[model samples]
Target chain A: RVQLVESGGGVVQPGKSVRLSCVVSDFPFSKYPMYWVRQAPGKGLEWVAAISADAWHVVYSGSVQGRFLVSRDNSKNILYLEMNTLKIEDTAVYRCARMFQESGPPNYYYYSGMDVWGQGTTVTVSSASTKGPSVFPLAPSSKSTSGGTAALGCLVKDYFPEPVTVSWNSGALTSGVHTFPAVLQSSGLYSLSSVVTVPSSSLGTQTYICNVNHKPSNTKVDKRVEPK
Target chain B: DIVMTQTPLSLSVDPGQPASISCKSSQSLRQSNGKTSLYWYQQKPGQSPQLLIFEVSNRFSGVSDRFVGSGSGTDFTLRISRVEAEDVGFYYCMQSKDFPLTFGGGTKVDLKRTVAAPSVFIFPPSDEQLKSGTASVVCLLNNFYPREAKVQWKVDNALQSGNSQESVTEQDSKDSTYSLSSTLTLSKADYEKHKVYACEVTHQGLSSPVTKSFNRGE
Candidate 1:
């Protein structure tokens, strides 16, 4: 019954600070490792810090390497994250996870990423100018002479936490294999593009419908495209 | 950085045949301590993968005994005893001997067994269990493997997006096969609407998707 419940931080304005806490129970908290991870909407998952189950060693990512302090109250079975001078970018869903270790001999430990996640605590930064995203259909960027392959994509940009979902309804596709790899742009927003390829005599009418779903600043935005 | 390589890009075996998969690392998988940090995983098509062995040879609590992991350092082997019909999927070897973990390219395996194909049966909620005015239609998938398959539900030809719950797959016996079950809950009125509900099963051992449906007559 290893469980971590994250608490604290709600609607903090820009330039303010917040302290988030995680109350742990069941397994010995001081014996195993716990980590802090944050997601800016549907953006790339960032590794915040790696707190050793014990205090022997710790590794902090470049994202939160400084200004972010991590501490634990071992006697109370609690862990903490203190962030100073927050910004609109810090408005993300922060979570604590219990690093699952393999079953082996005593003290034989390894990291395979966090398996169990808390019920994400949403930290909203009060910003009136925040907006969701704008997505549009794109023509097939791939050209193949094999007469058996083609590709198309959907471009999405200027959105906070672009948790985007792209689905296609085309039978020309041999199998329902699709890829949607998103990236964060330097403009303080996220840009995502999803591509679908049709392999195997896909001699079709070239009618591919792409659907994109994203929510930014707590707004439901959806875009449907039938690129030519 | 330790590089891991898996041999024989693919394997096709029949039920009752023994199979062995080899994983070679660029360097010793020994940890700073004494134990080696090597893990094995099995992933069936259309489903998430499962951890079979961890720390060289210790099997996960719910994994089958037929899956044996041995060897050390740069050379390791995953031996399957009498590879069952359900033992069809991709196998992966991951090493955590040093910082920045690494995994080997997966090896795909195909198993053949007509009788070993998972069978599906649906059970409606018993009277006592329907106190909430909703019936939980349980779908049972008995006798299947390499423990990586998916159970999806559809209503009236439309995929169901909610009201479904999945249960953990359980090992059946010494053969290393498995049994799994899932449930879908709906209001009594929806149940009596005589709508049709279908359970679609996808696995690597089977060439095509198979389904079992229950017709609630209007």
Candidate 2:
């Protein structure tokens, strides 16, 4: 049960410094490498800094090289990332993750990449923005038997400030659809995922579309996963 | 009746790289129900085959999310997001769309595991070849993972060319490791003229290339 619990992130103004913490458990904290990844609002994942087990080796991405300092306290099994010169652009969800290493005859251990991730801590660098949800439709099967069931999933992510409505082909869908609750991410965005199961005969040669309506922007985006 | 064909009888991939296997069926695998009667199975070392994906892309219960099955009709693919040690196994595509069930020849997903320096040996030329005025020396490499290596021939400290034939790498059935043999064929007169023939093997498992020398009349 290797796990990382993260904390110490919140509203940090520009030009200030904020320190984040990730506590490790169920594994030897001082024996593997740990990394920090950042998601800048609507942007993709960004690599921050990494600290090797025992705090001997450290590497940072150019984006965070000078502004971030990562260290670990093995005695307490805690990892810390100190970010300096915080900017409005630094507003992001900082995730702490652990890496698994493979050892060989050369008395060396090579890291593959991040294995376990902590629930990220959101750092809102005051002064802001609102982003609408990105909708992704997952078509269950390209082909199905007449009597067999097919399941499709719609993943709505990065919507700001509150509730979003999901519909099928411009109409409220029930019967075989399950909409999960919108979970707030560490970046202050809300994400909702849903799945719909139906008879394949009902989907014959037809594409099913998922429409996402975000009230904050009064924006409606629809997408479909067409079978190939 | 359906006939299934799988391509790549074997695969070699490092851990974390994506691996994909293609399965083709001679007849359409789609049943009247609209579902393709195709299934993907994984058989780990010494374990029975376990279902990974059924009905094409519908993951079997409890299968990891990394295994994805896709395609319809006679063509299909099984893709692994990242192959890991536990993911090493034989993957088989089975079709049950009709009366006679069929399966593709299994594809072996071999993880490029920890290296084992192959045992290099130089086999003497056969008496028949020598008597026929032509002789061939064999360089045999045994028990190596990754199934990749190169063999070179040299005599009297000079590289020799145009006389070497390399066999396709073969995997050991028991341990799943690989072995290869390369033969250096030349006129028997050249074999005696260049008495200090050497076989050099290069592989990742070795820190330095290994050179095995054979002296004629020894």
Candidate 3:
């Protein structure tokens, strides 16, 4: 019944300031309190802080106290987080969660639990954001020991604007490809791969294409596998 | 807020032996809902760690009920009914009562191991003037564990029978194990025959009894 959309990301550096925003729609954000939770890739979820509507009471974890500012606006139904000083560990996916105050108003709240969560926003605490993801496939120089039906994979990775969508084009071209979610790499970027089966009967002659579509641009990339 | 302080810092328990890891806190861990906020986790060497106990006593789904959580408030204990080989690794305890959950440093659990055999030495036979012609021989077993061990003497391949040989006292060593001394009585003539006297130690962890011998010169 409620949706929280988080919108804010940039190459925020150390000793610098970074602000994250969350918009609460469908349901008025005035009644419920919002919380900010973050997670480093491959690590467990950690509660950073929470801000009540009307921007009255804010609670922060001891680990992040004084370093983070959590506030929300009742009129605009938006939440904000301002991290004054940042560190490398601050590179994570920030999510907004709603704490349902079943009682009257948030000021008189007696019970608390996170009920709704927003799609996380990934923040790169790096020097600069890359040009974007690069999508390609196995090249001809790469020898394949596989003797069975040839399998082809398209990979999209090496930059920001994570969670790109990938599709494959066979024969007359149909947008049917299964791409798993993006995987975070040790280099602080995201990678995704999609695969399709190619019949050996048309080996060396058929043309298969992989399409990559990412946000910041619905514009897609088409990489053709011209079997030479 | 709840804080866990583990004792010994390192614990290696044997299979079938239960492990009671104490998780103490700075404040009472009981929450408003009447449940303590203590939880336990086990991280095997190279795999993903999993929840062993939750909400003080309830075992996580699929977690063996054998992993139990007990005690109230500031003093709590996580006990594994039987420490299996898979139970080897570090364990952590965390409290969810307050924000910014804090966790213990982690108590290492490995397969129970036995320390090396205690150093042994036999006192030279001395003729105590209390009883004429009587010899007093002292045998010391200074290191061994589980504390349940059999210490006895043998003279020339024959058991030195009787209540003559008795443990003086079993003292504790620095490692929480035991060391003890026992003595045997014999006729001076018997000991003068270059007797091959031996002290045999029997322990649960030992594959066979260990023997230490000394020969009295003729």
Candidate 4:
């Protein structure tokens, strides 16, 4: 019956601080301590920090000793993490886990396992010097003719700063729009895709343009998609 | 982008009863537009999926009021106030705020037919019999639903040669269920030859027929 919800993670620029929250439900926060674990891009999971069950003590891993702070609010049933001085290496999927003790109150013992976990919150640390995304033509497979709607896809590759916006026809579209998050590639660059659906009757007869905006570089790439 | 996960892969709900399904997103479904991107859909057999709830809780046009969707951010639930046989289908939750749209695996909803076995009773000839020389026995099937059952009379372990009479099943407004009365008539001398007379009631709700036998004396 235990459920942990983690939120408040997002793209943070270097030298900035970010606070993440994990809300616990159907269980007493005082019964178990909350631990923060993160998996960096292309790396294994690493323990970050933890708040004691009493909500009074804190412990941190050597790797993030000074920059990472863990705390909890018993009344709100929330566990929090504050990370300062973000670096690109800090980009990872951070998850909150509940620790259960197997032994007694006089003799405290742990079994090295977590009973429940919050689905991860992803953090992307972007620097000033980053690459802009390159836009590709919309895929033909995405075109729908007789159907009521047509799904259009535009691929953006090799981007950086992780916060890019995809719009249609210079912000003319309102609904049926979805832009995927930027993904870190093996080369350390980022790639993403955006999709939009419109009435099939407007296809080919009406030309639609996809705009990829990379705010850090103040650049926008535009490409036209004509489904026939 | 948030990952959508639904709890309980399948559900069996009784007709006229309530049912609930949960969909949890990995992250907040709230978007910069101030609307949660979560949506609920139902796909009945032999048909395409149709939108039921949009933007978390708003029911789409033409959707039944019995279907209610509520929740915000990462947690959402779709509840049916009273399930109908036509409501049998697969339910799915989807999120579209991020670039790549994601959907929960889908929960199958099947209708469960609840059965209430009929209580059978047998009555021997009474003082008010048609005639003192004639014998009559009655078989009563009580408190059953859906009205699908039959009663048969067997004399001495063999089917009764002559046809017995059965009354039409009547619904009792007190419980919204059905009951029936079946009677077997015989001459006093004819029935005396039989060692046992049995009434067997077979109903769709029951796996085995109910048999109530009457000995000559008892």
Candidate 5:
């Protein structure tokens, strides 16, 4: 059975942008494409667009381009729908749908239009509220070398004023500030890495976890590292 | 595969007023018989879309007399009589009978504060003891807008839930368009009662709902 779970509630300030998430479970990320749709109170359903897990392609109805964005995190099996220039009218039930296949002659894969759908989330944009926190994952990296220092990197980008943390864990080293090189891409984007030295004897099969914890209930964990 | 886009000539309509919708096809719908096989549908807001016409001119049994459909070749029209408050939303036209059944761009029929249509009843018959069981008669709604539509089964005019009904929706493999099929199971008891079953379709742009019913023959 394929299940889609979305956040419950979100509050946004008028004219500000908000991004909501839909996490799909029990399905291969590569098989189907995810879509975004909206249903307003007493209004007809609108077809937003669809995006694959790799974030490579998108298909949007003519009217909704430049207004909405869709992306997915393959590792986490999460699909995201972001709306810009929020207005009160945009407040409605936003759904994340999964289409059957990737590409075909038009309607070839249209056997079932969105066989599965997410229990939608409601977003209210108004003047009194502040924009909700952005939900963007950090760029993650992993490295391997049997007898040398092993470095893991986590990069967070396109988010503003949000505190971010990168923690390191290994089978051998339980705790410490394992330091490595840092790179800053641009405004509101930063990359940091932590490295730990491992002897040849302990190198062949060792496990590590790179945890990035961000404010407002966003924490990502990367697990199971093998040194080459 | 041909892509049919159905765009409404107009959006909102006054209550009790007449409204019209158009559906265009990317490819000519002229069939081997020299006739086009286009259909129309109406999908009010917040409901599943349903079929309004099938094979073009034949009206689905029990469709409102006020709702009329006409067109030929590639261009088609779905017209509503004295629009009601409930008649508001997008409309679409589709052509099946060809490979990859396609839908036209949808048109919206907007009315002010209309009550949603009530669900209807439909039941298929069953065979017993070793006789050829009669197949459930289909209720085809042959008027409305966009061609993309769905058919739902109901019991006693109430929504049926959790009844292991198998539904198959597919774009016409030959033409590259969409259509739906719903199958309901028949038990010996259902055969005894000879209840009526309704096929209700929700289409893209429609103000009111349409339905047709089939009952086991005596």
Candidate 6:
């Protein structure tokens, strides 16, 4: 069995080229061939092609010509897949695989597809067209003791369009009083922050937790605040 | 069996710029006829990679004319006419005419934003043995390497393509070799008249093409 590992993340300019790598483990370098496959957010798997262990003898399907290149490094047991002419839409997942062959009885033939696959890595392309949020507030400037009232706030980026929810929890959160506004901010593309105020009498030396839920599977949690 | 590997020394290309990939074979790719077994593929980002060339130079059906493959013996080249926005991702080459097919390490073709865009079921053949009427024949490449081999049946001097032939693969415990098989049924009349039904194994890396033909009467 061979284990495949790929890079974590990469940021490339819209027009520049980017190269990704996959390293294999637990197999004789000379025994099998490594293959590359690609998939987009909603697309199916595409057979990118395979490479020999020795870094020689290349075979490609006719369909993928002129688009990419495949290579290997025997010494490091690393297989490389490089994508050129980067585009914004090129963001997707890429995987590496190894093919196993069998020798059966005299005239009998056997067949199977890729048996092992990698977790896959995502590549994202960015350009000047991308913009950051308009407003970003700094952390709270003051803090209070356990039994005194305390206020905490956070800023949100503009590109994110989903509604958010904030919650406060103490060491046991068994009992506590909290306040929240109907809407955090009114600006369409401006950055905004949420504030939570807890009365001084209710605060103890115990810790508190704040959680925010964002759209598209994004969430964040923060612990009790300290003096800035 | 020979091992093949490809490591792109460089894969950077500007849009509209010419780009190429290199494939090397563990053993020389020269066939008995002196032809190198090599093929190229183009996998645009998000889309299935398409076959660009086979047997070093022959183009596959429906491939764009802009892609070209060249080179001889063990050294080969896969060149794209003008790099397009849609042409981003990886490119790979494979050698199939030999046993234990092989492929080159893939090269990724990245394009900025110019984005662009299987289950297995097996039905055994009805008749296990060849008879006197029209019979169907199938060839399978199981646990097959290099993924570039094609199967066909030849009777006498004519080559007949099977209407329902399919390649299926299974895992082999021993060497991790894929167990692949294809079935072809031929009519008893043609089977008897021709005297022999040949299973042709066509790929890119063999010096002499290998054929396994069977005599129906035997």
RMSD of each: 17.8, 27.9, 25.2, 28.9, 27.1, 28.9
Runs in model 3 lying further than 4 Å from the true structure: A2-5, A9-16, A23-34, A52-57, A74-78, A100-112, A132-135, A139-146, A155-157, A170-192, A213-220, A226-228, B1-28, B32-96, B101-218
Docking class of 3: incorrect
Q: What total of clashing residue pairs does each candidate reach? A: 6, 7, 2, 2, 52, 118
Tell me which residue pairs clash in candidate 2: A144-B34, A144-B35, A145-B33, A145-B34, A145-B35, A146-B33, A146-B34
Chain A accuracy as TM-score for every candidate: 0.55, 0.55, 0.69, 0.63, 0.49, 0.53
Clashing pairs in 4: A179-B99, A180-B99
- Interface DockQ per candidate: 0.03, 0.01, 0.03, 0.01, 0.01, 0.01
Worst 10 residues of 5 chain A by lDDT: A133-142
For candidate 3, please provide the TM-score of chain A on its own. Answer: 0.69
Query: How would you encode candidate 5's per-residue C-alpha lDDT over B63-166 as one tens digit per residue?
Result: 67777888777777777889876666566675644433345656655433322232222323322211433232222222222334566766567665544232
RMSD of model 1, in Å?
A: 17.8
**Per-residue lDDT of candidate 5, residues A123-149 (tens digit):** 765444111222221111112223333
* Cand 6, B chain, TM: 0.47
Model 3 clashing residue pairs (backbone): B3-B25, B118-B143
Better of 3 and 5 by DockQ: 3
Q: Say which prediction, candidate 4 or candidate 5, comes out ahead on TM-score.
A: 4
lDDT of 3 by residue, B77-110 (tens): 8888977877766777767677655566677665
> Which number leads on lDDT?
2
Predicted complex 6: CAPRI docking category:
incorrect
Question: TM-score for the first chain of model 1?
Answer: 0.55
Best by TM-score: 3
CAPRI quality level assigned to candidate 1 from its DockQ score: incorrect
Q: How close is candidate 1 to the true structure, as a TM-score?
A: 0.43
TM-score of 4: 0.37
Error of 2 at B62 (Å): 2.9
